[PDB]
UniProtKB/Swiss-Prot annotation, chain B:
This is ATP synthase subunit 4, mitochondrial. The chain holds residues 192 to 242 of 244 of the full protein. It is found in: Mitochondrion; Mitochondrion inner membrane. Mitochondrial membrane ATP synthase (F(1)F(0) ATP synthase or Complex V) produces ATP from ADP in the presence of a proton gradient across the membrane which is generated by electron transport complexes of the respiratory chain. F-type ATPases consist of two structural domains, F(1) - containing the extramembraneous catalytic core, and F(0) - containing the membrane proton channel, linked together by a central stalk and a peripheral stalk. During catalysis, ATP synthesis in the catalytic domain of F(1) is coupled via a rotary mechanism of the central stalk subunits to proton translocation. Present with 12900 molecules/cell in log phase SD medium. F-type ATPases have 2 components, CF(1) - the catalytic core - and CF(0) - the membrane proton channel. In yeast, the dimeric form of ATP synthase consists of 17 polypeptides: alpha, beta, gamma, delta, epsilon, 4 (B), 5 (OSCP), 6 (A), 8, 9 (C), d, E (Tim11), f, g, h, i/j and k. Belongs to the eukaryotic ATPase B chain family. It comes from Saccharomyces cerevisiae (strain ATCC 204508 / S288c).
Swiss-Prot record, chain C:
This is ATP synthase subunit d, mitochondrial. The chain holds residues 61 to 117 of 174 of the full protein. It is found in: Mitochondrion; Mitochondrion inner membrane. It comes from Saccharomyces cerevisiae (strain ATCC 204508 / S288c) (Baker's yeast). One of its GO terms (molecular function) is proton transmembrane transporter activity. The keyword Mitochondrion applies. GO terms for biological process: proton motive force-driven ATP synthesis. The gene is ATP7. Belongs to the ATPase d subunit family. Its main location: mitochondrion.
């Protein structure tokens, strides 16, 4: 590649200029290194939390500016590094190559591209730890959005800046819940609507690189990589990389949302990020805290999540809605990281172990799941008309709560049980099948109006598909309006009732 | 065909790097490091005289 | 263009354009349709006339 030769010439010209203006005579020499942390002397005037460029090639952050020995973790493998190699002060706080161009590119810790697509343009390289907007530059969740999979989403919405959280066991596919959530950035984002745009940016904090390939392929095939920047941090990658990755995602979220367009984020498994912070603290010198994990686990978690918000029109009414994903062991809701985060995030969707093998590909514990904004910022289809359907969702969840071993006191309880159980067998939006703001209310409305409830529970698995297709090719005007008019009016309710009669008939 | 092209492009950079190893070995083997020492001295002198 | 030395994108597009009609449709129903229509229509007309006569009776 002659272009590779030109790139080599340009880079070596930059290197020759750097060497000519080295301005590095008293810069530090790495005294010792280990566990991705390097104890380095010198560097007498290094600004705190500024990347340090190391001779072995791998760089790293400088965390603890201790008296004399300034501690810089190594953001790369140690087999290259060695004691005494020169440490070059980058002179800048850790900043991430950020901007709209990164679209479809998988970037390393600070933003080094890793797919092999070459450079990606930048609209700003800001520090990895930005101060979040306060009170006045913040605002309410006045603009709703769609989670894509019905996924108990009309039940508990995910609105502008709704800092929702999740949980699950190993291989719980909560990652897949995230992926489906992202895929909904194709029914609005793939159009041309900024107001409908929610430019998602997933993360990859500590996952097997094979899983990374699976994510990339699933993004391309369903045509998601057009709208999702997936920052990557391999399990084979070094601990400082994984630790800094969530900060990089924060930077990308700032670069997007701060511009004034409504954007979204979904941090990957953040439990690995916590384990990385544990490595960074307990390995460098910092005494451990509660749950044997580093003391500032909450501090790091907040500084990640608290970056997300929904600013006001003063700041452009944009937002960076976030869906941080935490992992437990044994689906443990009661844990230091899990409970502490559930205090930080404004929404929770609990994924169990039984249901993960018991009855639902989604297996989202509807009763356990909750979001701190159900009314404000919910699908206007799911509330403005189906607000009674949301209260019915809560009521039927409470109903199924008591459905374990109680007798048959009456027929009312039994009818509620059968209808709600058909509804639950219905509501699981199949994997990678995001199709929502068209007949969301329909399930509960038909159950209370007795359209689907009269069908067999098992048969609903195809009856729903038939009803949807009938609404599509037969109730096309009414279904398209429910998509677009923004509400299911009493007249549209009557037309949908007619379409429901048609679906019941054929 | 496109995938074959992408793989051959990567093979090109890999072969370029492999020949760059021999190129670097030439730099030490040939005493152009003698011809490089004066250049290093001049560059460092200019750098120190910069400020 | 993404394939700089494909040397077959010309050939592939040539086959594609030359394979515009892989085959034809088959609307061979031209007398079977007529016979089915005749049988069905005569039978249904007999049924309808019988039903009307039963109504009158």
């Amino acid at each position: 590649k002659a272009q590779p030769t030109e790139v080599s010439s340009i880079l070596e010209e930059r290197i020759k200029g750097v060497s000519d203006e080295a301005n590095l005579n008293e810069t530090g020499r790495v005294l010792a290194v280990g566990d991705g942390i390097a104890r380095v002397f010198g560097l007498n005037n290094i600004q705190a939390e500024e990347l340090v460029e190391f001779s072995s090639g791998v760089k790293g952050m400088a965390l603890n500016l201790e008296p004399g020995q300034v501690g810089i973790v190594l953001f790369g493998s140690d087999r290259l590094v060695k004691e005494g190699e020169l440490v070059k002060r980058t002179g800048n706080i850790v900043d991430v190559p950020v901007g709209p161009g990164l679209l479809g590119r998988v970037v390393d810790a600070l933003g080094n591209p890793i797919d092999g697509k070459g450079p990606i343009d930048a609209a700003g390289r800001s520090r990895a730890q930005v101060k979040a907007p306060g009170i006045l530059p913040r605002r309410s969740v006045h603009e709703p959005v769609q989670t894509g999979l019905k996924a108990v989403d009309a039940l508990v919405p995910i609105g502008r800046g709704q800092r929702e959280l999740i949980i699950g066991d190993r291989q719980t596919g909560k990652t897949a819940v995230a992926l489906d959530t992202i895929l909904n950035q194709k029914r609005w984002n793939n159009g041309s609507d900024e107001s409908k745009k929610l430019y998602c940016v997933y993360v990859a904090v500590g996952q097997k690189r094979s899983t990374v390939a699976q994510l990339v392929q699933t993004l391309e095939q369903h045509d998601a990589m057009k709208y999702s920047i997936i920052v990557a941090a391999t399990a084979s990658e070094a601990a400082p990389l994984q630790y800094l990755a969530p900060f990089t995602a924060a930077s990308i979220g700032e670069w997007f949302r701060d511009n004034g367009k409504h954007a979204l984020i979904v941090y990957d498994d953040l439990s690995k990020q916590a384990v990385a912070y544990r490595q960074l603290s307990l390995l460098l010198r910092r005494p451990p805290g509660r749950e044997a994990y580093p003391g500032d686990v909450f501090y790091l978690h907040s500084r990640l999540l608290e970056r997300a918000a929904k600013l006001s029109e003063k700041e452009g009414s944009g937002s960076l809605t976030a869906l941080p994903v935490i992992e437990t062991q044994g689906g443990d809701v009661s844990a230091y990281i899990p409970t502490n985060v559930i205090s930080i995030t404004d929404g929770q969707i609990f994924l169990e172990a039984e249901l993960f093998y018991k009855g639902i590909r989604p297996a989202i514990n509807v009763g356990l799941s909750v979001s701190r904004v159900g009314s404000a910022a919910q699908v206007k289809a799911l509330k403005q008309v189906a607000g009674s359907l949301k209260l019915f969702l809560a009521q039927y969840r409470e109903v199924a709560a008591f459905a374990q071993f109680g007798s048959d006191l009456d027929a009312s309880t039994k009818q509620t049980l059968v209808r709600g159980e058909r509804l639950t067998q219905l509501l699981k939006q199949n994997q990678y099948s995001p199709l929502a703001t068209e007949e969301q209310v329909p399930l509960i409305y038909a159950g209370v109006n007795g359209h689907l409830d009269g069908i067999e529970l098992s048969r609903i698995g195809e009856f729903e598909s038939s009803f949807l297709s009938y609404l599509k090719s037969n109730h096309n005007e009414l279904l398209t309006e429910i998509r677009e008019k923004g509400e299911l009016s009493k007249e549209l309710l009557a037309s949908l009732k007619s379409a429901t009669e048609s679906f019941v008939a054929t | 065909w496109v995938r074959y092209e992408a793989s051959l492009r990567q093979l090109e950079q890999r072969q370029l790097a492999k020949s760059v190893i021999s190129r670097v070995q030439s730099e030490l083997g040939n005493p152009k490091f003698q011809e490089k020492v004066l250049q290093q001295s001049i560059s460092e002198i200019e750098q120190l005289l910069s400020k | 263009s993404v394939l700089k030395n494909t040397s077959v994108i010309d050939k592939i597009e040539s086959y594609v354009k030359q394979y515009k009609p892989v085959k034809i449709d088959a609307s061979k129903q031209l007398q079977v349709i007529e016979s089915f229509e005749k049988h069905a229509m005569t039978n249904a007309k007999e049924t309808e006339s019988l039903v009307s006569k039963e109504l009158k009776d």
